[PDB]
Design a protein around this ligand. Structure first.
Ligand SMILES: Cc1c(C)c2c(c(C)c1O)CC[C@](C)(CCC[C@@H](C)CCC[C@@H](C)CCCC(C)C)O2
Ligand SMILES: Cc1c(C)c2c(c(C)c1O)CC[C@](C)(CCC[C@@H](C)CCC[C@@H](C)CCCC(C)C)O2
Lengths: 121, 121
């Protein structure tokens, strides 16, 4: 669920998730997808596409277990959907962290009209 | 959907909805409800409870029609659920405007996992 995703994002990036990613670019936080403005935004795009792939669980609502071991997010599920869901969240948290180097505040609260259509997943 | 909700908030409050209300207190934003931090937050609390009563439509993604007449949000007939949804959104937008005076930027990006459990609606 969003609770685990937000925690992973904090864990990986060290940043308040809503502040840095609640509305960033065309894919982070915003509703729907759009052509990514940069790497951080692409992480969110990949994430939404990852969610689109799930079957059997609600990405927003379903809780799942995971742990922090050797400073790594370790999913703790066997159910295919919760496992994949957890893995989707883990990937976006890592990706956001990995792209902090090009994170650009000008994309915070990016206006949707400036977003081009996303390639489909 | 979030588009309409955001537009209403912008219309009533004059503020960028994502920035001011995308994540505020324990109730404005993702992650259900929590004991409200202040009046602004209380608006979002009532708003989430309002959504609970909806049957047949998705508050997040289902778009609907409304008009700005005499500077008032006027919900389109749409269908029962969408009309109720529109009324839920209109109410929260009005409520946020009425309480703009006590908006506290300290609650923007409030960490959801530092909210007491909300009472049931
Ligand atoms: C519906 C939906 C939303 C809302 C969205 C994204 C996607 C793919 C969605 O389908 C991606 C990014 C973003 C805004 C990012 C924000 C992450 C939130 C889940 C964060 C909530 C954070 C809390 C729990 C962690 C607190 C930890 C304490 C120790 C401080 O969330
Ligand atoms: C997953 C999820 C999210 C992310 C969420 C909420 C709920 C119940 C959810 O289950 C409620 C409130 C908010 C806090 C939404 C507040 C703002 C948005 C609706 C922004 C809309 C965009 C605005 C600029 C549009 C302006 C109109 C243009 C014509 C200029 O975010």
């Amino acid at each position: 669920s969003l609770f685990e995703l937000g925690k992973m994002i904090l864990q990986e990036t060290g940043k308040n998730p809503a502040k840095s990613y609640g509305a960033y670019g065309c894919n982070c936080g915003v509703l729907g997808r759009g052509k990514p403005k940069d790497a951080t935004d692409r992480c969110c795009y990949v994430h939404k596409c990852c969610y689109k792939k799930l079957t059997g669980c609600n990405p927003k609502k379903d809780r799942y277990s995971y742990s922090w071991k050797d400073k790594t997010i370790v999913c703790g599920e066997n159910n295919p959907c919760l496992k994949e869901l957890c893995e989707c969240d883990k990937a976006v948290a890592i990706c956001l962290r990995e792209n902090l180097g090009t994170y650009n505040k000008k994309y915070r609260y990016h206006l949707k009209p400036f977003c081009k259509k996303a390639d489909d997943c």
